[PDB]
Amino acid sequence: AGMSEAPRAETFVFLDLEATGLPSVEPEIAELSLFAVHRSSLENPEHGALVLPRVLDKLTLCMCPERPFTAKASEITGLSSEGLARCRKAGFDGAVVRTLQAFLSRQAGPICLVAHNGFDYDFPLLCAELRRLGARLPRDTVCLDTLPALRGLDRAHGYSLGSLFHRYFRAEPSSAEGDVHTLLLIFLHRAAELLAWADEQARGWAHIEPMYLP
Amino acid sequence: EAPRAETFVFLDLEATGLPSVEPEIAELSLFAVHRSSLENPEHDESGALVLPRVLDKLTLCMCPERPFTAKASEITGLSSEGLARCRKAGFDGAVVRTLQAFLSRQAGPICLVAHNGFDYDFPLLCAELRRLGARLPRDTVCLDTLPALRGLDRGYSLGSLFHRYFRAEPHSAEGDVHTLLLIFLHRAAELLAWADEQARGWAHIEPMYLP
């Protein structure tokens, strides 16, 4: 009875970013991974173990950031400016924006972006990078941050990808892509709850504010 | 004296049947690897081969217009019901724009690499792009690892090649590309040489069939 203003999403795009540091540094995306999943699949998880949906769109891109990585970031991401320049990856540009948009256009909309801790990091950062270029996402795309959502669902009935995974699956996880890979499994495990939360609480992408301006 | 390939784009297609039924792509996967990563395999702390850290990937699912061959649906895990249920449209402009932008992200010339590309992946890919007047960068060349390996050697499925080369495996477009890449990494210098000498230009690839 209590419908939200937020349009109901038909595709869930799980995503993760590997960046150059924390907000105070005006970090940049060095790597991004998108897993596009149709609502169907989240409503009928596959297996006797839980497995990724068979029908899945994936997009992983590497870029060379304009500014340096902090030592800790290269360390935890295995990524560095030399490595990215050696492979001739340009920085977040028009090419990247077109690939993102073409890819998103392959999804039945509206789209709900799903990132862990998205509200405080991935979303504003993605938002900053796109803003520099004036790029827009499909209208009525919405956002779900599984971190506040899962804490909410649990206070109703810690929260790093690692603990979450160990607690839900008795152990070991497996990179922007691996991180999206393990976020999806976590989601699949509380699928029914996360879907309802997204329907009732997803934030409009228009409400997301760029981490910083160019 | 033409510049050799700078990026090697490894790909695989999951389709609906053998060429005679005029198969359609249902899942396509692309791994873009810069030449320097092939020239320099990276290793595990254990010393085991690993994929290059810097890798671009694209996996797209599509619903074919015509039916799946039973065998095809079985080995691939894909079905018309499934693709339709997820609203995955057929090979269209959105697929083309996605591929072109993705490839525009790679330092060229590009060398497409597929196992059995010559008899299957290339011509099939070519047919579905042709249908839309789509084309790929004109300096794109192609490498088919089936004749290349059989060539270098003189069982050849991806599976038995993997067994023979590492011992063990992991169907899935992405899965197959992943194992093709480790396999290529295992004989990189031989295959890089083979590619520089015998890769064929994309423009001389023919559509498997017209609609």
UniProtKB/Swiss-Prot annotation, chain A:
Record text on cofactor binding: Binds 2 Mg(2+) per subunit. The second magnesium ion interacts with only one residue. Substitution with Mn(2+) results in partial activity.
GO molecular function: 3'-5'-DNA exonuclease activity; DNA binding; double-stranded DNA 3'-5' DNA exonuclease activity; magnesium ion binding; molecular adaptor activity; protein homodimerization activity
Keywords: DNA damage, DNA repair, Exonuclease, Hydrolase, Magnesium, Metal-binding, Nuclease, Nucleus
GO cellular component: cytoplasm; nucleus
Subunit text: Homodimer.
Nucleus found in the keyword field: yes
Residues binding Mg(2+) 2: 16
Effect of residue 179 to A: Loss of enzyme activity. Almost abolishes enzyme activity
Annotated protein name in UniProt: Three prime repair exonuclease 2
Organism expressing this protein natively: Homo sapiens
Swiss-Prot record, chain B:
Protein name stated in the entry: Three prime repair exonuclease 2
Database matches in SMART domains: EXOIII (SM00479)
EC number: 3.1.11.2
Source taxonomy: Eukaryota, Metazoa, Chordata, Craniata, Vertebrata
Localisation per UniProt entry: Nucleus
Record flagged with keyword Nucleus: yes
Documented effect of changing residue 176 to A: Loss of enzyme activity. Almost abolishes enzyme activity
GO annotation, biological process: DNA catabolic process; DNA metabolic process; DNA repair
Role according to the record: Exonuclease with a preference for double-stranded DNA with mismatched 3' termini. May play a role in DNA repair.
Record note on cofactor: Binds 2 Mg(2+) per subunit. The second magnesium ion interacts with only one residue. Substitution with Mn(2+) results in partial activity.
Reactions catalysed according to its record: Exonucleolytic cleavage in the 3'- to 5'-direction to yield nucleoside 5'-phosphates
GO terms under cellular component: cytoplasm; nucleus
